[PDB]
Design a protein around this ligand. Structure first.
Ligand SMILES: [Ca+2]
Ligand SMILES: [Ca+2]
Ligand SMILES: [Ca+2]
Lengths: 110, 71, 155
């Protein structure tokens, strides 16, 4: 129906917005990250706290570092079993499947 | 509690008294900022791992399709 | 792939179709029917480096010989000249961008949303045949494998 020169004209424009919606999704995640880290890692309110509540906050932070660190390890391990099986699927699906200038300069030259 | 729970509860309290209990209000303000930046860094690395997990399932699901469709 | 070459010839400025016509008529000096046999092609091959067998020379011809003459004329010569001049990791990420509903396939209306967000005035026949060229098994959708072979040759 339409020229073959058109069908490549439209593909070049698909991989141009699918490359624009790919990096717009990026800085829609950096904003999402900063927002989500202001809820989880709330900035500290250290002015006014006496020694008691200073030393109580420092202790509750000492116990949260160890809690957050394995909340991360348990998602760090899920993506480690997903990498291993991504390579399992990506493989088991593979087990089922002249020169221009060198020639124009020979016959011509300039 | 019992004793291996007692041992765990006691040693973890001993971990705080070793790093926090010899500090004054200024020396321990700095400790709180230091401990918070560690949390910001591990929560960021978790968020980055959380988003990769949402993506690996899509990749796994499409690989699940291609094996399902190519036999 | 194929129709990326055919599309390349239709975009050749007449500046380039004067270059190739000039060179092509140099190719076919001594040839009686004015076309490129293996006699003509082996000349230019020894002119630059190598010397293939008179069947390696008949494999470059039959690769673009679409009229069944065993020779190359000028219109076929242009296809020969564009052949002589992205990846799966790039395409997999862009595949996910067509697949808005995230089901693993690219159905019709997901193409149209993409097509209707491209800036061009998308006609129905455009939608009708980009779906026809991309989807080869005819299940009304472009899966992963079909999408790779559908962007083959698109920068
Ligand atoms: Ca021919
Ligand atoms: Ca879809
Ligand atoms: Ca299909």
């Amino acid at each position: 129906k339409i020229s073959a020169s058109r069908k490549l004209q439209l593909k070049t424009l698909l991989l141009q917005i699918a490359k624009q919606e790919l990096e717009r999704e990026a800085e829609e995640r950096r904003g999402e990250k900063g927002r989500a880290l202001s809820t989880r890692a709330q900035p500290l309110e250290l002015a006014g706290l006496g020694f008691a509540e200073l030393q109580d906050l420092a202790r509750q932070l000492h116990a949260r570092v160890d809690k957050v660190d394995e909340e991360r390890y348990d998602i760090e391990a899920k993506v480690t079993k997903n990498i291993t099986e991504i390579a399992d699927l990506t493989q088991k699906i593979f087990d089922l499947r002249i020169s221009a200038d060198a020639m124009m300069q020979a016959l011509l030259g300039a | 509690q019992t004793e291996r729970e007692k041992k765990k509860k006691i040693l973890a309290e001993r971990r705080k008294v070793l790093a926090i209990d010899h500090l004054n209000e200024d020396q321990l303000r700095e400790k709180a900022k230091e401990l918070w930046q560690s949390i910001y860094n591990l929560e960021a690395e978790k968020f980055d791992l959380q988003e990769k997990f949402k993506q690996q399932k899509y990749e796994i699901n499409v690989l699940r399709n291609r094996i399902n469709d190519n036999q | 792939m194929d129709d990326i070459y055919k599309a390349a010839v239709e975009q050749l400025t007449e500046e380039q179709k004067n270059e190739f016509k000039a060179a092509f008529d140099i190719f076919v000096l001594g040839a009686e029917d004015g076309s490129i046999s293996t006699k003509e092609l082996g000349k230019v091959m020894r002119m630059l480096g190598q010397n293939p067998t008179p069947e390696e020379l008949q494999e470059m011809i039959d690769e673009v010989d679409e009229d069944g003459s065993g020779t190359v004329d000028f219109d076929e010569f242009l296809v020969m000249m564009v052949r002589s001049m992205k990846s799966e990791e790039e395409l997999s990420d862009l595949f996910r961008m067509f697949d808005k509903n995230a089901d693993g396939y690219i159905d019709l209306e997901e193409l149209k949303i993409m097509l209707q967000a491209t800036g061009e005035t998308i006609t129905e026949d455009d939608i009708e045949e980009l779906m026809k060229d991309g989807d080869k098994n005819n299940d009304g959708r472009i899966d992963y494998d079909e999408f790779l072979e559908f962007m083959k040759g698109v920068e």
